[PDB]
Design a protein around this nucleic acid. Structure first.
Ligand SMILES: Nc1ncnc2c1ncn2[C@@H]1O[C@H](COP(=O)(O)OP(=O)(O)OP(O)(O)=S)[C@@H](O)[C@H]1O
Ligand SMILES: Nc1ncnc2c1ncn2[C@@H]1O[C@H](COP(=O)(O)OP(=O)(O)OP(O)(O)=S)[C@@H](O)[C@H]1O
Ligand SMILES: [Mg+2]
Ligand SMILES: [Mg+2]
Lengths: 277, 271, 277, 277, 278, 276, 277
DNA sequence: GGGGCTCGGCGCTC
DNA sequence: GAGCGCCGAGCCCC
């Protein structure tokens, strides 16, 4: 393994070591942590691209040493779980907190195999986007499926940890790729103006107001892809309209909820409609 | 053949040797095998392009010694088969194990000619992507026909050993091009932001839940004459595990020692 | 004017070596001497020099020989009844002497406006076998890009034989095609090049769907029938070859074309090749 | 990971200066010191440094600075009578040392839910003179486009102060305004952009009308008066200003705060302000 | 603040100062003022971008952050102003040369408050086109009120050191906005394909052969806004016709005129019609 | 602000050269000197230098030079050998009278009579005279009267304008009376903002009466006198020989050079007095 | 002004060489010398000098050299019995010397309005073998592209010879067609370019029908035949050539158009070329 | 759905 | 290395 030993090489190695230690995975965090370093590294033209390269290398080295559970699950219990917004929404909706929390934990770790996405389906103003945002932002680098663009939808989901599909239906053009990335199957997807890369199994969380198991194409809907999708989804149907002035789901709430999940884990039947009784 | 002799050329010849001798083909594998090596080569633009050049050259060098049959057949015997998972998948549906195994083995060596594509077709949760992914990852290089991007579909199938068309449907924009790769025909395909390149014959696995020998029917006969068809129809359980990267080798290697003549046909005969 | 420097000496040695060995693509270059390719890829001027060397060597070989030099053979044929092209053309009916004369004429650019041979027939009859044998008997051969629309006839520039594998005559490229398939000069697009030009070269189409009927969206306009038929001969193959029949090796192509030059006979300018003997 | 060099030192000094002056775009730089702008904008190595420096100044100021930093002046003030707003306070009775103390607590967010200001009085009463000066002072300032019902608070994101000129309250934005007017974190919809969170930003309002009255079509309701009376102060500037008093210069703003920080007095948490008897 | 000091920096500073001073907003004027400098700076690839950057900076620095009189009052004093055509144009129409010139200076300096306009009125070929052009072209940046375009009549009136309302015909749709501008009051105007911009107090000059006090609204004419309008403009009615060989006025002459004004100012009033020397 | 250096000095020399010899496109450069162009195109540095030199020279000659290049530098001892002289002499026009008028037309000396209308049948030297003189000055325009929308599109910043086979039309009569009147007038340009045309002497070769405004199937002479107050008409009736040849750029310069040395008074008449 | 160094001298030598041997594309460069071309691709400087050299040589030729300057070869001609054009002409009824003289006049622009020569006759008569021989014997040439009705002559600008290979004449460009065929300047519209003037250039036409036919929508009118026949010296190929007749080499064309000048004969301006000595 | 529209990341050339 | 520039792949509007 040749190891370049120039001055630029030494500076770059030190920078990426510091970045991987301090968990910095974006400029914003850098400028929040050490202002002098960033201002200095923007003071030329060699280092301007070196910044982007360093951030990408830090992202790669973190993604290959820490998976989703490392960040999500917390390190201390809560000792009183009712203020958690997540628990209150999943309780008032009807599901019991134990089984609902076991399913979430078994979805961060991929213990469930093909079922690699949790589908939140509820009328407007129920919590879908809130929980999705919390679980998506609690990780270093998440991914959003650009459902508007139909020729390169999963373009930012290369080398990520948690994918989040915010809205939209399952068009007849993205069903073929969705069945691959939702199913946690290693494939090689198309990259804009570049060659293909590999998408390792990444858990997904889809929030929508309209059904995804019946593909929709313009003025016609299809049902041949209803079993293959329904066998790779959990379907949390959240109905009760969330009261006004309900606190933004704060990262610490997500960490504590998942920690309580790991504390009271209970086995969950491997089915589509998550048991609610 | 002028051999450039300098410092940079020697270092590059040292990097490509290390890459080939360690089976490294992608950056991720480079990081896993050695971290300081990769973190160094992103420093300057020279090395940043040298990384891509070295990976491509290592890929080419590995291919010009080997082929698919040299990776998919293990170096040790089986001594027990009923525990295997490809065997179980093929036995549940009724297919005689060794007949279909001979079909697979011949499909790997290109012994059948124009018919070098296995089409696994069946209802949901039957065991198609399992076998397909096991076979595709047992080999170092594998392509995947792009579903979207109907202008450069077969861009990732230029110098690969085993193609894997996942959840594919035959649209009229790919039929005329899929009539070349699925038949091992030596043709020059279009690449992106690069000059056209040549595709040597390559086996192809197709796993589709919908009929794939009909364009959406004038191309039914020419398409169903370059693919076998294994109609898997038994719903599996969730305890049934993944086809490990080592079970494929055991299956194909148990095949090489019990090969049987396979009747050239579109519908692989049950029983 | 001969630029005499060290780099010019290296380049001249490289091009002379390539022409003496017969390399026309990078893959063969590696396959002959790996050290050469790896070294000439190391540096930053590397890629430019490799691309220029390949293009220049191909140009030299193309100017120093033509299609008949490669296709025709220097040794005679003891008995042609074994060669598979003869059997393909005899099962269907065509008298092999007449068809051999037609093939030899098309190779040597001698029939004027009918500069192409069209093979058409139901599935598994023998089209692609003959086409690929002929195409690979010549060191250089082009192929039309089926899907790409912004650069359709790329890779057909300065080749010896053009091989349209399974093409369909789309309305986008009907004019440029009506000109390339006619032994004339056309203005074609290219990648990162300034509107290069196509020399008049033989073309061998092997589509199993009608090639003289243009398709417009979901419509088929027969307007362009006469312009296309007046510049192509047609071999209507019907018989169904069986497996374990083998592919036409290059030696067979050379032997057949040689057996033509020694037995040539006249042929009328007719779209439908005279079906009999 | 600090780049020590000449260009690095110059860039650090420049961006520190920029964040010190709150300069964001060039035009402001020109107005502050033209010679620096020129001297930088000559060579090709500097014409990119300027853009990068403006971007870095913007980011540093946004992510690590608040309004009271750019408002509170530096040099101590010996006289405040000459202060123009002071006169606009004394002339209209409002005790300067008290009425001035009102803003500072609003500047430093010391009044929590009462994190907004409303200047009251007829036209030609310096309201927009006291707003614009206390609306342009901060580096990034937002203006409430109450006329645009869809996106009234579009420009209030990533700011340090929010301007409301001739503000009129409508029932459609009353719920949105109360969150903004109360200094509470809230998310607003941006045109052609995702919803963004408006962090507590001391807002300023100028309207000769009554901000406690909600206008809904042809009906006006006071149901949100007290809710709107608990979120902001109110100064009635009856005395019209002379035609020669002019505007309020930035210096006349800052010096007032530097004087309003050295003469602090206890302020009340009431809706209205008290006038010096 | 930071200032870079290098060999290139000194030359660039000199160039931008020279540009802001001479009034060289664009290249072509650079050619017309010193061809040697342009033919020189165009030589290499390090100067062929220096030119464009210098022009951008100069246009910006001048158009903003500087006052219009700064290129209407010259430097070298004027001994004999009678030779100046304007002195002849005003003298020809019985306009006391010293009074109007004093009125001219005040209008440029905004000293005449809301009366921020000069309306050269009368038939054609009476100096109205000559003066306006000579004065409008004099300043670095100027615009022409596009009254014909109702949507954005004042699109090109932003950051214009002088506004020339050529053959103006004020309409009912622009009367309100015109009064604020004609009054020199800060007003926001809509720009085509751009956000609304504010027009700081900016002088005007109106040349027309129709009465501006009349509001043209379709087939009806109303003088309702007559009094406010006449409180925002002066009236230098020019009736005498000029000779065919009179010729155009030069910025050299215009400079002299407005320079003579500063040396021959006199007390002035704020009525609507300029008094003619009896 | 003067940048001085070897490159700057050579560039200034080249641009003085180009502005002196009236060069505005590469083709003309190869014609006047192929060796210079071949030499310059060698290095990758000088390509941009050539492009900049050509554009800058064109702009300079546009904005700081006048049309009377028509006057040569060296004196003309003999002018009898000039085709233009022979043409004018052959057409009953006194060489010192029509040359003097010609000169006053180049210098705009006539105020309003800004154009020289060449009249007569084909092959009488009209087109040659216009094509010869017009190709003399660096920049010149062609009146595209066939294009009603933008007939004077190519008449902006032109040292000389040509109206080849012109035909007055009602739509363009007002604009044409403005141009031929040597008066500044703004014209509409295709895909460009309206531009002003400064006074530019004009030369016309036609066989139709320009004083006859054409409007569909009707012809009106209402604009006769105003147009007749804007032209210096010439009637070239004699037919030229086949081997007469074109007028060389050296001849046109020689002709006007003789005129400058033999200036005589001219009368602003709609008909140039022939030599009795 | 003239730059002088070693680089300038080398480029001057190269451009002189190209203009002497009449080169306008790489292929010809390799044909006339190989070590020259291979040398100039080594470095990037040479690979950029090649394009400029070809452009400048092409220009200088199109400006200062005319059609006869290359059609009439530079070396003497001894035997004129063998030349393929000579044999073809003697195989129809034309005196070879007289036909050579008429072609020469068509080259040196001698017959005035009759500035075109027309190759008429049935298929397989060798129209291509002639036109493509002459048209290849001048540095540049163009092909009348009637498929582009907007700019049929867009490829016939600054050409020393023009090839009317195929396509009929449209009514919309009859005047321009007469101008081109009549050796008269004419401004033609160019695609994506300003109108360009086509100087008097000889034209060569290859037709199996009457090109005088003029298409006006659905109407084909011969009213323009007489104006055209006064503008064209026509040749009417009598019968079919032998397919083994060979190809008229460039050297054969040079020999023909050199022996023509050495033995010019008087011509008569009839529409047809006299069929005798 | 078929035309043009600029745009982005890259190469390549200086 | 700067920068420069181009260009194809890609994108959007009518
Ligand atoms: N990552 C995994 N972990 C555990 N089991 C897995 C995993 N991936 C697949 N399986 C098993 O694979 C079995 C069948 O899955 P698949 O092979 O994907 O079926 P399939 O035929 O491909 O379904 P489709 O809809 O046709 S793609 C399931 O019963 C799972 O137990
Ligand atoms: N930043 C925030 N501050 C305060 N409340 C918030 C914030 N973000 C979300 N909420 C609350 O989140 C609750 C539920 O919002 P959502 O989950 O977005 O409802 P939703 O309709 O399921 O989302 P959609 O349909 O995907 S837009 C609302 O009642 C808000 O009060
Ligand atoms: Mg699958
Ligand atoms: Mg085929």
């Amino acid at each position: 393994a040749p190891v370049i030993r120039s001055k630029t090489s030494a500076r770059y190695m030190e920078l990426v070591g510091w970045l991987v230690d301090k968990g910095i995975t974006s400029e914003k965090q850098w400028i929040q942590e050490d202002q002098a370093s960033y201002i200095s590294f923007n003071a030329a033209s060699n280092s301007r691209s070196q910044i982007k390269a360093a951030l990408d290398n830090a992202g790669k080295i973190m993604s290959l040493t820490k998976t989703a559970p490392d960040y999500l699950v917390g390190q201390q219990p809560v000792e009183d779980i009712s203020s958690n917004r997540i628990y209150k929404i999943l309780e008032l909706n009807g599901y019991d907190p134990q089984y609902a929390a076991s399913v979430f934990l078994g979805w961060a770790t991929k213990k469930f195999g093909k079922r690699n996405t949790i589908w939140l389906f509820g009328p407007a103003t129920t919590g879908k986007t809130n929980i999705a945002e919390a679980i998506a932002h609690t990780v270093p680098f998440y991914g959003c499926v650009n459902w508007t663009n139909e020729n390169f939808p999963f373009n930012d989901c290369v080398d990520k940890m948690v994918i989040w599909w915010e809205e939209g239906k399952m068009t007849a053009k993205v069903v073929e790729s969705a069945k691959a990335i939702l199913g946690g199957s290693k494939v090689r997807v198309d990259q804009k103006c570049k060659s293909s890369a590999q998408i390792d199994p990444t858990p997904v969380i889809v929030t929508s107001n309209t059904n995804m198991c019946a593909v929709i194409d313009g003025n016609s809907t299809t049902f041949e892809h209803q079993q293959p999708l329904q066998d790779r989804m959990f379907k949390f149907e959240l109905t009760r309209r969330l009261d006004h002035d309900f606190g933004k789901v704060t990262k610490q709430e997500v960490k504590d909820f998942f920690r309580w999940a790991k504390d009271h884990v209970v086995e969950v039947e491997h089915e589509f409609y998550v048991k609610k009784g």
